[PDB]
Amino acid sequence: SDTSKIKNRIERLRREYSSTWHHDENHPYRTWNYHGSYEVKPTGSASSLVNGVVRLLSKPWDTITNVTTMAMTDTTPFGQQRVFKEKVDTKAPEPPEGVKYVLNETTNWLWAFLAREKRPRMCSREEFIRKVNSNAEEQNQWRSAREAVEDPKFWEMVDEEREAHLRGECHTCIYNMMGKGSRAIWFMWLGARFLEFEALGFLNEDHWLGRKNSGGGVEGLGLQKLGYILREVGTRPGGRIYADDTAGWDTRITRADLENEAKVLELLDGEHRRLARAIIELTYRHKVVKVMRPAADGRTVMDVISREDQRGSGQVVTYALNTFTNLAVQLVRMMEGEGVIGPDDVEKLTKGKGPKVRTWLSENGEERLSRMAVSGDDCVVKPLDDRFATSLHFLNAMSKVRKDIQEWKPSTGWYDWQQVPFCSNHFTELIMKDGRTLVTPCRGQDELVGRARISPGAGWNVRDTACLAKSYAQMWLLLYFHRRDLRLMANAICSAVPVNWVPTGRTTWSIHAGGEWMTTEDMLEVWNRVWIEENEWMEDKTPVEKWSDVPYSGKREDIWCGSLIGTRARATWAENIQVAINQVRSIIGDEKYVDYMSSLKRYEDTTL
Ligand SMILES: [Mg+2]
Ligand SMILES: [Zn+2]
Numbered sequence: 001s002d003t004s005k006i007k008n009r010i011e012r013l014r015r016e017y018s019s020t021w022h023h024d025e026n027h028p029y030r031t032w033n034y035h036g037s038y039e040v041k042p043t044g045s046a047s048s049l050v051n052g053v054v055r056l057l058s059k060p061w062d063t064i065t066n067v068t069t070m071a072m073t074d075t076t077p078f079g080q081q082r083v084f085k086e087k088v089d090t091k092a093p094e095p096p097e098g099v100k101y102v103l104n105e106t107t108n109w110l111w112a113f114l115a116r117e118k119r120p121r122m123c124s125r126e127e128f129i130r131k132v133n134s135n136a137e138e139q140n141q142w143r144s145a146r147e148a149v150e151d152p153k154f155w156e157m158v159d160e161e162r163e164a165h166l167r168g169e170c171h172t173c174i175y176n177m178m179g180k181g182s183r184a185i186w187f188m189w190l191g192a193r194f195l196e197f198e199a200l201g202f203l204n205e206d207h208w209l210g211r212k213n214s215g216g217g218v219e220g221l222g223l224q225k226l227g228y229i230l231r232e233v234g235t236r237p238g239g240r241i242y243a244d245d246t247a248g249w250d251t252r253i254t255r256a257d258l259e260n261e262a263k264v265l266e267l268l269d270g271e272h273r274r275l276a277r278a279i280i281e282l283t284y285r286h287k288v289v290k291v292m293r294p295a296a297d298g299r300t301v302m303d304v305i306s307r308e309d310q311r312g313s314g315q316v317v318t319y320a321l322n323t324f325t326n327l328a329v330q331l332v333r334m335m336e337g338e339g340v341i342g343p344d345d346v347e348k349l350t351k352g353k354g355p356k357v358r359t360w361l362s363e364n365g366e367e368r369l370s371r372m373a374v375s376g377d378d379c380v381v382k383p384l385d386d387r388f389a390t391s392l393h394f395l396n397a398m399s400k401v402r403k404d405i406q407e408w409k410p411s412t413g414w415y416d417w418q419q420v421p422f423c424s425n426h427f428t429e430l431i432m433k434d435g436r437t438l439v440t441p442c443r444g445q446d447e448l449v450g451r452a453r454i455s456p457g458a459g460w461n462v463r464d465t466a467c468l469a470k471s472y473a474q475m476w477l478l479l480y481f482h483r484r485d486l487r488l489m490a491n492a493i494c495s496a497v498p499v500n501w502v503p504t505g506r507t508t509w510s511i512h513a514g515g516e517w518m519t520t521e522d523m524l525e526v527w528n529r530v531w532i533e534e535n536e537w538m539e540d541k542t543p544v545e546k547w548s549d550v551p552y553s554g555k556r557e558d559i560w561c562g563s564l565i566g567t568r569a570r571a572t573w574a575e576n577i578q579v580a581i582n583q584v585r586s587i588i589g590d591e592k593y594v595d596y597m598s599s600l601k602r603y604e605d606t607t608l
Contacts, residue, residue: 044076053469067450077292107260165278215369227427227439234417249377337391445562468505474517
């Protein structure tokens with residue numbers, strides 16, 4: 001029985017596409033809420049756009065049914081529909097009273113702990129423009145945003161919608177962006193992004209989930225640190241190291257989870273609180289999504305639907321909230337594992353022990369938090385003992401059902417942290433020529449090159465494509481330098497792309513903190529700065545003076561993670577790449593290029 005906080009939106013939409021507005025009676029939506037549609041052109045890209053640079057400089061990976069399949073997506077109104085006709089439904093049942101009580105206490109203690117030192121604040125339009133002028137949003141039309149911010153007409157709209165919220169109403173926030181001319185629709189998706197940043201941006205801008213403030217979080221830490229954090233955690237005495245995943249986390253978030261997240265509001269006052277409340281209850285709990293769909297008579301239409309008690313939006317606020325909730329979830333599971341609560345307390349908390357839960361949170365919460373590494377729905381926990389493996393009563397009752405395992409089958413962990421996966425990566429200890437040890441991230445090489453082969457917008461803008469390829473290359477040199485193929489392929493890209501071109505585009509995926517590779521500065525210089533100078537786990541600060549001195553994985557670890565070394569296809573590519581490099585050059589044109597290759601061929605380890 002809901003459709004009120006949304007009425008405002010559907011209206012502002014109906015009176016713009018009114019010349020097109022209409023009801024379909026063919027809407028396939030029975031899970032979402034159909035509100036009508038309007039005629040629109042079909043923007044749905046045929047399928048996938050390849051990065052011509054990364055692609056030409058990786059011929060062997062042409063025929064790898066693991067990097068290929070990862071590229072072709074369906075942006076067409078047809079694909080947008082097929083996808084939308086598969087999404088999960090298994091409406092996470094609200095937790096029982098006993099579970100709801102423990103979660104309430106836990107989340108009460110957590111919010112208090114996070115707010116112990118820092119004070120919430122509103123983020124300015126200046127911070128916005130600055131986070132906009134760098135940081136990322138999802139493509140290279142990100143310059144359209146850098147421009148929209150300089151336009152007084154975009155902020156005029158923001159002023160109108162901001163005033164609208166201070167009274168508890170939403171008009172132009174729809175987290176979907178599709179469609180003298182007008183760019184209003186764009187000024188709105190972005191506007192909603194600002195209003196949200198202004199109201200709840202402090203969580204991330206002030207690092208409320210950084211390890212220091214959250215104890216278990218890792219916000220702001222790049223891959224150069226995550227490895228060392230895993231080691232530190234995977235060393236506190238106790239049971240094995242557990243790293244369970246929730247099956248479809250986003251769909252397992254309950255109204256109870258949403259209520260607990262919404263407790264931030266109690267931390268705020270006056271205008272800030274009112275602005276934040278409009279975000280939480282208008283733009284988060286009530287979603288307004290747009291979707292293209294092929295209608296009758298070959299005409300395409302934009303369907304305007306909505307959902308109740310939805311996840312949220314603005315993947316930066318989302319990340320903070322997901323981290324918060326997961327931290328709470330793990331604390332509860334630990335409580336059970338330690339025998340503070342059990343199967344008898346699930347339905348109704350027992351034998352007068354609510355004070356025991358508050359005592360445990362009070363005296364153990366902080367230490368317990370330091371035994372976790374939580375990044376959104378991803379986590380690593382080292383409990384006091386292995387009773388954690390069977391501590392599944394509250395976990396399952398919270399709808400946080402583990403992925404790839406029977407509901408009541410105890411979890412399995414490890415002893416050696418050197419193999420625990422975290423943030424789509426397995427962190428390894430690497431011994432350099434000079435005896436020193438690094439802790440580096442590894443992950444399947446097929447996914448690494450597969451992602452680099454992907455590019456936004458039907459690449460007509462070479463500069464962007466080459467610049468994106470360069471960020472991937474330099475990202476690899478910084479994080480995946482130990483992988484033989486990536487080091488070689490990276491240097492090829494850097495040799496084929498003009499030296500003066502600044503790397504642009506998105507490389508940071510899944511993870512977020514990072515971006516050090518987005519420079520025109522020498523990569524050995526930045527490698528030195530992040531792996532030695534600024535590495536608080538690096539005792540000896542003596543710099544490395546050559547790439548040959550920067551270690552590789554063991555020939556065995558390189559393959560463990562998908563190396564093509566030892567293969568003929570890769571033998572033929574490593575030896576005659578200068579041709580492809582030249583080909584790229586000729587195509588991109590007459591520019592200044594530097595050769596990072598030859599210096600590499602000097603330390604080429606081949607055929608075993
Ligand atoms: Mg995990
Ligand atoms: Zn709004």
